[PDB]
Ligand binder design. Structure first.
Ligand SMILES: Cc1[nH]c(-c2cccc(N)c2)c2c1C(=O)CCCC2
Length: 127
């Protein structure tokens, strides 16, 4: 069994900028979710080999995790906040696609997503 290569966190050909919204996403949003008790399944890519999930990457074609997001934010990978928000929503969506309602992992994603939504509600004005 085989995992795919993880999502890229560096791309010198990709335009990039530092914005106050992106710093908020690192310093407030990512920090809030990273320290949560339910964060650990989401801090790195899903290892479908060790987890014995050979169908994971057959179903999930856009994997995403907070470890990748953290490195992308720290490496200034993004152009705008929307790109980073999309990555967060992709990671939650993957969890809901692959798992059953009521699975513990879904309850964990749900709790993180609630905090995510509470924090992005106060995303500062782009300035
Ligand atoms: C998001 C997610 N994370 C992890 C996991 C579990 C233990 C260790 C590591 N690194 C990752 C899983 C998962 C799923 O969606 C499928 C359900 C269980 C596996």
């Amino acid at each position: 069994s085989m995992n795919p290569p993880p999502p890229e966190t560096s791309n010198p050909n990709k335009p990039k900028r530092q914005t106050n919204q992106l710093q908020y996403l690192l310093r407030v949003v990512l920090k809030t979710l990273w320290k949560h008790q339910f964060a650990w399944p989401f801090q790195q890519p899903v290892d479908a080999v060790k987890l014995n999930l050979p169908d994971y990457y057959k179903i999930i074609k856009t994997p995403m995790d907070m470890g990748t997001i953290k490195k992308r934010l720290e490496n200034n990978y993004y152009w705008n906040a929307q790109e980073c928000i999309q990555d967060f929503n992709t990671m939650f969506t993957n969890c809901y696609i692959y798992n059953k309602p009521g699975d513990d992992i879904v309850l964990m994603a749900e709790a993180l997503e609630k905090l995510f939504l509470q924090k992005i509600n106060e995303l500062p004005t782009e300035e």
